[PDB]
């Protein structure tokens, strides 16, 4: 009263695991072979009946494509998102991921060819472009690889200016769109320390501030003689301002 | 004889012989005041050989006197002191201002011959004339090391990003009736960078006619092109010649 090995079903292999004798009421499920998927709603199993007789079963496996190809730009739409049965002719549709945008000129759909291969995918979903980085007063924005989603940009300040803020920004996905990670930094003028006053001399047209390359010219009072260069200059190595040298001196 | 011998001795005077030893009648000999002495005007300074081998009568005619007034750069002598040589002790000479100096009213332009036959110490009665205010230089500076009086000097320079055109210095010279700066104020032109470079498959945003120190040019890539590099470049002006900070960006298709 024990059934032998289940019948032979084309493109399917019964899950014995790993018996030989199956007691009555024993339900054996068949699994479709590679490149085959069970046709929905069809009998895929048998059962040991009275008389050591297995129930009846017939071909339930049709040729089908592998689960659609995973793409970075687009995700599958329902119900394809949970389907496994893709008989030749099956057409699936994708929906742009975040943050990508649809390309009007192309189909977000794929077709299951006769060779069980999904049709070549195009760029139906492209990277969303980030806002124009803008401009940094007395600074520069380095765009090494565009400004689209995932892009990075670095910042720098021209000579004589110190950078205040982030040195870079990434085009990350922000809510409903792609947004720069960090805001534009600031390039603030580097100022030299107050020029030195000298004994018996003055500074001609003294100023409030002194930035890179600006200068101060001294003048000895009446009766005194200048010893040294008349002027010094604000040098700005290295994000800190410093006078070129020492002020002249006035000998009476 | 009919002939005289050596003329008589005169204090502070030495007769111009010479080196004659005999003098025929009518011969006239003049005496010459010794050092520190000058002949008193309207006074007989010579003798003649009279009959009887006798020299005419002569009396002291030399008075002590200071030398010719001191030479000054500020002032010169007025008339008639200008041509005078007779400066008895206690004599006062007046000076007038030279070009280009001016009078210091509170100061005496007069000098006096002291007992030791020297000139009274002079004072600054003739001051140096001032020069007009140098003024200013647009985008430049004027270095005035030692005032703006007669003989003064000033130099010129341009601010970062500008180039001096003209004189580099100016002297306060005497011009006709006063003192005037030898050279006019130079000009501080503006260094322009060479026209920015055009880039393949890209454009320059809001291109300008001229770019000066620090001015920036923004680049933009055409449709379907990718930017690889800096977004903008600026004009750097080392060193009286302008040059772009770096290379423009690439617009990769």
Swiss-Prot record, chain A:
- Which keywords label this protein? Blood group antigen, Cell membrane, Complement pathway, Disease variant, Disulfide bond, Glycoprotein, GPI-anchor, Host cell receptor for virus entry, Host-virus interaction, Immunity, Innate immunity, Lipoprotein, Membrane, Receptor, Repeat, Secreted, Signal, Sushi
Question: Which positions are glycosylated?
Answer: 62
Q: Which GO terms describe its cellular component?
A: cell surface; endoplasmic reticulum-Golgi intermediate compartment membrane; extracellular exosome; extracellular region; ficolin-1-rich granule membrane; Golgi membrane; membrane raft; plasma membrane
Its Gene Ontology biological processes?
complement activation, classical pathway; innate immune response; negative regulation of complement activation; positive regulation of CD4-positive, alpha-beta T cell activation; positive regulation of CD4-positive, alpha-beta T cell proliferation; positive regulation of cytosolic calcium ion concentration; positive regulation of T cell cytokine production; regulation of complement activation
Q: List the disulfide bonds.
A: 3-48, 32-61, 65-112, 96-125, 130-171, 157-187, 192-234, 220-250
The Sushi domain extends over: 2-63, 63-127, 128-189, 190-252
Effect on the protein of changing residue 49 to R: In WES(a) antigen
The entry's stated outcome for residue 207 to H is: In GUTI(-) antigen
GO MF terms listed in the record are:
lipid binding; virus receptor activity
Record note on modification? The Ser/Thr-rich domain is heavily O-glycosylated.
Q: In which tissues is it expressed?
A: Expressed on the plasma membranes of all cell types that are in intimate contact with plasma complement proteins. It is also found on the surfaces of epithelial cells lining extracellular compartments, and variants of the molecule are present in body fluids and in extracellular matrix.
Family (UniProt): Belongs to the receptors of complement activation (RCA) family.
Any idea what job this protein has? Answer: This protein recognizes C4b and C3b fragments that condense with cell-surface hydroxyl or amino groups when nascent C4b and C3b are locally generated during C4 and c3 activation. Interaction of daf with cell-associated C4b and C3b polypeptides interferes with their ability to catalyze the conversion of C2 and factor B to enzymatically active C2a and Bb and thereby prevents the formation of C4b2a and C3bBb, the amplification convertases of the complement cascade.
- Which disease does its entry mention? Complement hyperactivation, angiopathic thrombosis, and protein-losing enteropathy: An autosomal recessive disease characterized by abdominal pain and diarrhea, primary intestinal lymphangiectasia, edema due to hypoproteinemia, malabsorption, and less frequently, bowel inflammation, recurrent infections, and angiopathic thromboembolic disease. Patients' T lymphocytes show increased complement activation causing surface deposition of complement and the generation of soluble C5a.
> Domain comment, in the record's words?
The first Sushi domain (SCR1) is not necessary for function. SCR2 and SCR4 provide the proper conformation for the active site on SCR3.
Subunit details for this protein? Monomer (major form) and non-disulfide-linked, covalent homodimer (minor form). Interacts with ADGRE5. (Microbial infection) Interacts with coxsackievirus A21, coxsackieviruses B1, B3 and B5 capsid proteins.
Protein name as it appears in the record? Complement decay-accelerating factor
- Which organism encodes this protein? Homo sapiens
Which residues of the complete protein does this chain represent? 35 to 285 of 381
